[PDB]
Amino acid sequence: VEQSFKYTEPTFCPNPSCENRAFWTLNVTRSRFLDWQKVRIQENANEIPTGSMPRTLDVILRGDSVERAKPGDRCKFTGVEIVVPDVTQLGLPGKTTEGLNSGVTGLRSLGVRDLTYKISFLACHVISIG
Amino acid sequence: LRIIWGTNVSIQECTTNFRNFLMSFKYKFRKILDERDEELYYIKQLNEMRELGTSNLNLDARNLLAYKQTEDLYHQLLNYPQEVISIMDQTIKDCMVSLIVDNNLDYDLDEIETKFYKVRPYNVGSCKGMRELNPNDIDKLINLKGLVLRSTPVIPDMKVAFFKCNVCDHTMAVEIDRGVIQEPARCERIDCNEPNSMSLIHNRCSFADKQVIKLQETPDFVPDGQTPHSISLCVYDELVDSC
Amino acid sequence: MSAALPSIQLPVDYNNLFNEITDFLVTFKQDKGPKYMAMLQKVANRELNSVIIDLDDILQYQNEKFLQGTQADDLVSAIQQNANHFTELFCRAIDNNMPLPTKEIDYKDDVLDVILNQRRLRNERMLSDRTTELFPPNLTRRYFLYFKPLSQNCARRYRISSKPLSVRQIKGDFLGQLITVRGIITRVSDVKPAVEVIAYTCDQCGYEVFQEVNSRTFTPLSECTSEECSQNQTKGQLFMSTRASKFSAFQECKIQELSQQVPVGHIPRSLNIHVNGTLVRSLSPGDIVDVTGIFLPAPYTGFKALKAGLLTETYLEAQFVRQHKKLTSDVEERVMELITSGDVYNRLAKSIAPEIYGNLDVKKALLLLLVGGVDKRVGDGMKIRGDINVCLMGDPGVAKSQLLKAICKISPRGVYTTGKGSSGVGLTAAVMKDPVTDEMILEGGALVLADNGICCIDEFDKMDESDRTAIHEVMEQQTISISKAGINTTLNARTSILAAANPLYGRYNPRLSPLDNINLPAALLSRFDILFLMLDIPSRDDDEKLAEHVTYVHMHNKQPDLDFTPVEPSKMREYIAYAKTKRPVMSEAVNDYVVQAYIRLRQDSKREMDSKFSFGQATPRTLLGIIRLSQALAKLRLADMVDIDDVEEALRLVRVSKESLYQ
DNA sequence: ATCGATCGATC
DNA sequence: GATCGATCGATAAAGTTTTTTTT
């Protein structure tokens, strides 16, 4: 259970002494799903000091809260925070000195890389006053 | 006094040499700016730190040049500028406690004596831009005059780590304090816990703030042919999104 | 190995040259004994880090070795047969004759002083702390070497290495040699710290490991390699440290060609150059210079199979730069000549631009704008206008840019522009593409860099959709800004404008109305002050002199005419700066008389009220210009005589401003 | 061409 | 059963003048 932010390979504790971590087969039958979307937000008009490139961030809607967020309106959110990296996986090969903190983050137990950490945000419940 | 492989700095004489200079000041500098002051700004302000509970002391730091002693401390600030602020953050906690030992009714000696205050030596020396920054300037104070251009939001930083392997309950929290994260190659928390899948729960250990800003100098009497170049910034304390 | 690894029987070794470097101790007393050893004393006390081992101290070293009949091989051959093997054997020859403790430095008065001895003594004590690695020679240097070739009559004495070649013919055997090339320096990078030594710390044994630096990419080592913190069950984990390793300077530049040694065919060819030692921060974009330096190709070390089989993409390494063509401060003997002789109104008028036909009145109207004239140090919140802007019009066949912009090419801080290229959005600053280095820099045109100077423009009907607004925005006070999506910051605006709006089709018909070829009336009505004109009338007497004015210049190769003693432009350049240290203050007698001079200017414009010829409708915005230029002409003619006689020179110049169309 | 990972062999 | 050595496989590339409707 509990596939993490990159755990596309459940490879722990087989029943018999078979070849553990040898393969997998993502069954579309029993593994129940849920539906989501990824939208961007923006800061309200009555708080900007000047035209000073008003920054933003990104959210994730998880439950039934999909499609309740009509785009282009003043809106409120739940408030759980999160940080999500994704640089090393099975498929595709993974300016300034952005990600300079990442050099500290090296040398995990798997292969030596430069793993970053970017701030993001998760929601649970939406409301739209106005 | 102690001796470091890196520096040559002393033991806490200069802290005490500051603390008598700090407390027994009441006026100085009347001679370098000779015009003709009954009590120092900092003397009232050091009382003013506790009664608001803030953590910042904006030190002018051109007082050691006015004082007769503490020149050695003054000319070690501009030559090992990481340990000297790392020393003075300990002293200002104790020099605040040097006021709480007089009046024991000052915030119960516990809770404001947990959050670490800090200092800010500003407007020291002089500098003239970018076409003088030699490679010898490795660890010094610099005084830039320019213009910032554009900012990115805050990304986090590894100030504390966390670990948990696949046993029942084992929630150790290792530190980093370097550019190097250290791991165990065999488990713990039980006798029969062999080398196994030590996992990295990332979204549990706390992080501070950090922000990089890009700067380009103003054309301040540039010789009318040279393109104004750029340099970046970096910040750690509670100054993010205040500039 | 086999397969031709035994080389040829080369008769030229370096050991026969090595002992002929050991003789470079004290023997050359001519050039207060050994003078290169005398310069060796002025480096150890740490005030300059550049020695110069030239060739005149080698040929005269061989000139006085001509009489000794012994085998002395040639020296200027091998230092340009292969130049790069003549920095490293000098360094292993300097230290045997290097007097170290000739200075006296206790604690301060030297950068990195106590720690270099501390980093020496902690390895000096560990040379005998067993009851071991020697210093690499690049560690304790704090100095560099340089070179200098020759192209004097010493080369015409007897027997090249310093002929000023161009980059079109440097393709062949000139690799690993010493060649000076002239050119034009473009694309100046910044100064970045390069690495020459290293020191990793294990935090267990403290043996800082050293290594040499190869090309632009390298790799750290392991941690179980040292002599104390290795070889046990616990190993000191390595990590770096900045201050335990020196760092040098670095800057990159590209060269082009002189646009006259290029042949009739192909475009010019670029080249790469580097800098070392302390020649840095001594070049500029636009320097008509030449560099002398040694040659080296470098490998690419990327994508080596499917590209870059044996290619080179070389550069050259610099050794020496020989740059060329660069207020009572000991030139006052030529600045007093204006004060003794005087002759402000006409000799200075005939001084600047003496190559024109007539028009001595209009060359006076520009020179007071070359000294400007400050309006007022206002103090309070009254940012008043100064630095008036004079515009011209008219259609001659003389291509009048030589009549304006030749002044602009000798005037201080006077930049030139045209129609194409810098538009009105390209007049101010902007954010554009850049190379692979730091992009979105604030590139600009003129007015963000020509502040408090001269902005001489041509072709006023070119790129007008962005131009026509922005030229108002310097006359509109202090709004030169970049209001793009990037930022909303605003810089200053303090520059005068000289404009020559070319007319429309044919001659400007004087029987027709004006403002038929000028674009913006709003700039002309109050945002300008005075106008001139360049009409043509067929004249029998003047034009044959004008024919003699142009036919005479092809007999000789000069213009000796007009019986005037020509003056160097640096003289009045100082006198403008000398006038800039005056700033006279007006008296009260002036405004008692000019108040009704405006009234004398009032009813005559209110007499016409016609759409036939003239402009102006009696505004004080016309009046304040003649108040501005009055103290301006008082500035160049400082006797502090701000009176009626000074202001009659002002109305002298405004009566010829109007009615330039009445012929 | 270099580095990392996996497999096989030896202690 | 664990550790070390050898062999095999996978990893690094770059853009900005002609032509369409449209205002």
Curated annotation (Swiss-Prot), chain B:
Acts as a component of the MCM2-7 complex (MCM complex) which is the putative replicative helicase essential for 'once per cell cycle' DNA replication initiation and elongation in eukaryotic cells. The active ATPase sites in the MCM2-7 ring are formed through the interaction surfaces of two neighboring subunits such that a critical structure of a conserved arginine finger motif is provided in trans relative to the ATP-binding site of the Walker A box of the adjacent subunit. The six ATPase active sites, however, are likely to contribute differentially to the complex helicase activity. Present with 8800 molecules/cell in log phase SD medium. This is DNA replication licensing factor MCM4. The chain holds residues 177 to 427 of 933 of the full protein. Belongs to the MCM family. It is found in: Nucleus. Component of the MCM2-7 complex. The complex forms a toroidal hexameric ring with the proposed subunit order MCM2-MCM6-MCM4-MCM7-MCM3-MCM5; loaded onto DNA, forms a head-head double hexamer.
Curated annotation (Swiss-Prot), chain C:
Its main location: cytoplasm. InterPro entries: AAA+_ATPase, MCM, MCM7, MCM_CS, MCM_dom, MCM_lid, MCM_N, MCM_OB. The keyword Disulfide bond does not apply. Residues 344-551 form the MCM domain. Its EC number is 3.6.4.12. GO terms for molecular function: ATP binding; ATP hydrolysis activity; chromatin binding; DNA replication origin binding; MCM complex binding; single-stranded DNA helicase activity. The keyword Calcium does not apply. ATP 2 binds at R527, R621. It is found in: Cytoplasm; Nucleus. A motif (Arginine finger) lies at residues 526-529. Keywords: ATP-binding, Cell cycle, Cytoplasm, DNA replication, DNA-binding, Helicase, Hydrolase, Nucleotide-binding, Nucleus, Phosphoprotein. GO terms for biological process: DNA replication; DNA replication initiation; DNA strand elongation involved in DNA replication; double-strand break repair via break-induced replication; nuclear DNA replication; pre-replicative complex assembly involved in nuclear cell cycle DNA replication; premeiotic DNA replication; silent mating-type cassette heterochromatin formation. ATP 1 binds at Y357, G397, A399, K400, S401, N502. GO terms for cellular component: chromosome, telomeric region; CMG complex; cytoplasm; DNA replication preinitiation complex; MCM complex; MCM core complex; nuclear pre-replicative complex; nuclear replication fork. It catalyses: ATP + H2O = ADP + phosphate + H(+). Acts as a component of the MCM2-7 complex (MCM complex) which is the putative replicative helicase essential for 'once per cell cycle' DNA replication initiation and elongation in eukaryotic cells. Core component of CDC45-MCM-GINS (CMG) helicase, the molecular machine that unwinds template DNA during replication, and around which the replisome is built. Component of the MCM2-7 complex. The complex forms a toroidal hexameric ring with the proposed subunit order MCM2-MCM6-MCM4-MCM7-MCM3-MCM5; loaded onto DNA, forms a head-head double hexamer. Interacts with CSM1 and MCM10. PANTHER family: DNA REPLICATION LICENSING FACTOR MCM FAMILY MEMBER, DNA REPLICATION LICENSING FACTOR MCM7. Present with 166 molecules/cell in log phase SD medium. Belongs to the MCM family. This is DNA replication licensing factor MCM7. It comes from Saccharomyces cerevisiae (strain ATCC 204508 / S288c) (Baker's yeast).
